[PDB]
């Protein structure tokens, strides 16, 4: 009787919730952006094969420089590249081979690994001796690690198959915040530009707006079908995109608490691994399990471009912070630099 | 240029050391070990998070990777064993009420598309249990498996020497309705390897190596291009 | 959102008949294949049934072939299961369960404890 008083509150609520988005719902983005220019026919080439893993990449976060970025693959290895050259930086070998996320610190001073193993691993690039050691291991995920992001050298947001995300104190290894919420697997999380908020999307078809330090989960945002694999702020902030298993991005706006855009074509029938935005926010670039990755118009809804250049399943997907470049990492063990 | 070519002989002395890694990674099997908690797959081989088991046959060396420290949500993690050579799907097959759960867990193993080519090495576990369950006569498959009514035994099938021929028919009629999943997709990319084993036997690494052996075979011919 | 709403549950007689509806919105229900899976009193998520997409692959665990009858009418987007010649074994919550991923032939975890895809169910309970 209680559980059912419940279950009618929160079936109240969230019909309460979808009338105020109704509400807000006056126009769509595609009839706003109807009048605006196309952006034409998006060509990206290969310029740099950053070839030297031997197994399935998994995950890539370019640094901040725009020129160096970590690749985890699962042959038990952290690459680091200078992307300019190819040259390695780093090969860290990890104590758990199969790693699901990496993170490069903005300063460039630390990367982060993780995966079934439950454990964040942090690596010090800078360290006396000049060789790259583990620095920290933060365990307490009582699931595998799907997504990690530093927010400077002390704190780094987790995602895990344990439903929840965890804000890590990297000097302590505890976590200072667990983000409860969601009830299925988190797959991905992205860090707003301000570091005061961050969206996590997960195995539930939902994503979820979280305050850093407040601690609770400020929205939650549903209309995909399927598990959200992927997820990416807008460069404003303002808004964040989603790939999912339901073959289709959506892009949601945070002030206005819905769904804005769906990109979808029924060619499409594979999910969205990995999702980033350029650096306008105008191409939304996303990897897919059909082997390619898809730029597409993220005002207009329309695919601007393939980057069909994988022979395996794209499993990340980043973009360079002064938007040069795109470096898709797949199940081929290649990471390709297009721009 | 001196910054310069030190980067790159850092990079090609990073480029040595993995490609020693990986001849080393490459002469590692990579298994995936699959079961539920009745199965009895910690006790196959017999030698927190994901747990890993390193056994060696004929100078072949085994990694056999036990995922546990994980919800019972698998979809996800599963994805990262799509270029392991095989899984080891343990099944308790005297738990009858769990059965059509191991199959079903099966089903989604043998059609899954990053699963969709990697052979399944099956240990049908607890065939003690089975056999004294079948001559105990309590529990009946029919009561979980009506089509074990009209069920017979194979003529290709070999019996155990004393072997009860109600117990060979159970046996084998959970092993063909395995079977009935693995020949029903993925013919050639991938197959499924049954194997009768109790918690007493010594011989499974043995049939993990000739059932490796018969995968790593079948892709050195699809590398070759013969099949 | 992903919704299942399931009803037609209640009391029944030993070998009567019940009609379980489930109401799915928030995705394509013709994209995915559909389960109807089920939790007994002090045992864990059993699966009962899945029809594929189309509507031809259809399979039933053991206990309830011949006696249940998965069906879907991808119109209306609704899931139904024919419980016929009901046994106090059936008595449980049935719960509709989609298939995670569209336009797939696996469906992993749908008998998970706290599976997303899965609606709140209706207890059905055969008793005299």
């Known amino acids: 009787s209680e559980l059912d008083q419940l279950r009618q509150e929160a079936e109240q609520l969230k019909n309460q919730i979808r009338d105020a988005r109704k509400a807000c719902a006056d126009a769509t983005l595609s009839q706003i952006t109807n009048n605006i220019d196309p952006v034409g026919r998006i060509q990206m080439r290969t310029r740099r094969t950053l070839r030297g893993h031997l197994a399935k990449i998994y995950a890539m976060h370019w640094g901040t420089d725009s020129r160096l970025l970590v690749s985890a693959s699962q042959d038990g290895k952290l690459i680091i590249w200078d992307s300019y050259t190819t040259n390695k930086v780093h090969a860290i070998p990890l104590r758990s081979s199969w790693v699901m996320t990496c993170a490069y610190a903005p300063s460039g001073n630390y990367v982060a690994c993780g995966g079934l193993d439950n454990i964040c691993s942090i690596y010090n690039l800078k360290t006396r001796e000049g060789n790259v050691r583990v620095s920290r291991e933060l365990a307490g995920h009582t699931g595998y690690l799907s997504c990690c992001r530093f927010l400077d050298d002390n704190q780094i947001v987790t995602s895990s198959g344990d439903t929840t995300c965890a804000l890590w104190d990297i000097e302590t290894g505890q976590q200072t915040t667990t983000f409860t919420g969601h009830t299925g697997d988190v797959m991905s999380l992205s860090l707003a530009p301000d570091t005061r908020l961050f969206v996590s999307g997960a195995c539930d078809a939902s994503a979820k707006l979280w305050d850093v330090r407040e601690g609770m989960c400020r929205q939650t945002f549903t209309g995909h079908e399927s598990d959200i694999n992927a997820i990416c702020f807008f460069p404003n902030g303002n808004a964040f995109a989603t790939g999912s298993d339901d073959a289709t991005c959506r892009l949601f706006d945070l002030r206005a608490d819905q769904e804005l855009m769906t990109y979808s074509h029924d060619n499409i029938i594979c999910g969205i691994t990995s999702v980033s935005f350029s650096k306008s926010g105008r191409l939304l670039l996303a990897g897919y399990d059909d082997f390619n990755c898809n730029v597409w118009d993220a005002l207009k809804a329309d695919r601007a471009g393939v980057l069909a250049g994988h022979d395996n399943r794209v499993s990340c997907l980043g973009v360079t912070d002064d938007g040069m470049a795109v470096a898709t990492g797949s199940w081929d063990s290649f990471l390709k630099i297009w721009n | 240029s001196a910054e310069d070519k030190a980067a790159v002989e850092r990079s090609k002395m990073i480029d040595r050391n993995l490609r020693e890694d990986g001849e080393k990674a490459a002469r590692e099997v990579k298994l995936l070990l699959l079961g539920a908690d009745n199965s009895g797959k910690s006790t196959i081989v017999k030698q927190s998070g994901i747990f890993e088991t390193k056994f060696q046959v004929d100078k072949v060396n085994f990694h056999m990777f036990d995922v546990g420290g994980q919800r019972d949500e698998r979809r996800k993690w599963i994805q990262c064993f799509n270029d392991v050579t095989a899984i080891i799907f343990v099944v308790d097959s005297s738990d009858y009420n769990r059965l059509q759960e191991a199959l079903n867990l099966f089903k989604s193993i043998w059609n899954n598309r990053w699963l969709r080519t990697i052979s399944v090495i099956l240990f049908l576990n607890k065939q003690d249990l089975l056999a004294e369950k079948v001559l105990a006569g309590k529990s009946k498959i029919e009561d979980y498996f009506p089509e074990f009514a009209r069920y017979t035994t194979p003529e290709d099938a070999t019996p155990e020497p004393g072997e009860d021929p109600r117990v060979t028919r159970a046996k084998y009629f959970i092993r063909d309705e395995f079977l009935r999943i693995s020949t029903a997709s993925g013919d050639g990319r991938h197959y499924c390897y049954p194997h009768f084993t109790c918690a007493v036997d010594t011989e499974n690494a043995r049939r993990i190596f000739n059932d490796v052996t018969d995968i790593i075979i079948k892709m050195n011919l699809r590398d070759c291009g013969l099949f | 959102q992903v919704q299942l709403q399931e009803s037609g549950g209640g009391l029944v007689q030993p070998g009567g008949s019940l009609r379980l509806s489930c109401a799915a919105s928030?995705?394509?229900?013709?994209?995915?294949?559909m389960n109807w899976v089920r939790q007994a009193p002090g045992k864990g998520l059993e699966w009962v049934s899945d029809?594929?997409?189309?509507?031809?692959?259809?399979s039933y665990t053991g206990s309830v072939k011949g006696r249940f009858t998965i069906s879907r009418d991808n119109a209306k987007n609704t899931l139904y299961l024919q419980m016929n010649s009901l046994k106090p074994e059936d008595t449980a919550v049935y719960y509709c369960?989609?298939?995670?991923?569209?336009?797939?032939?696996?469906?992993?975890?749908?008998?998970?404890?706290?599976?997303?895809?899965r609606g709140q169910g209706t207890q059905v309970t055969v008793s005299s």
């Open positions: 369960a989609r298939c995670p991923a569209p336009f797939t032939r696996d469906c992993f975890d749908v008998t998970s404890t706290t599976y997303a895809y």
């Open positions: 029809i594929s997409q189309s509507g031809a692959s259809i």
């Open positions: 928030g995705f394509t229900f013709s994209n995915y294949k």
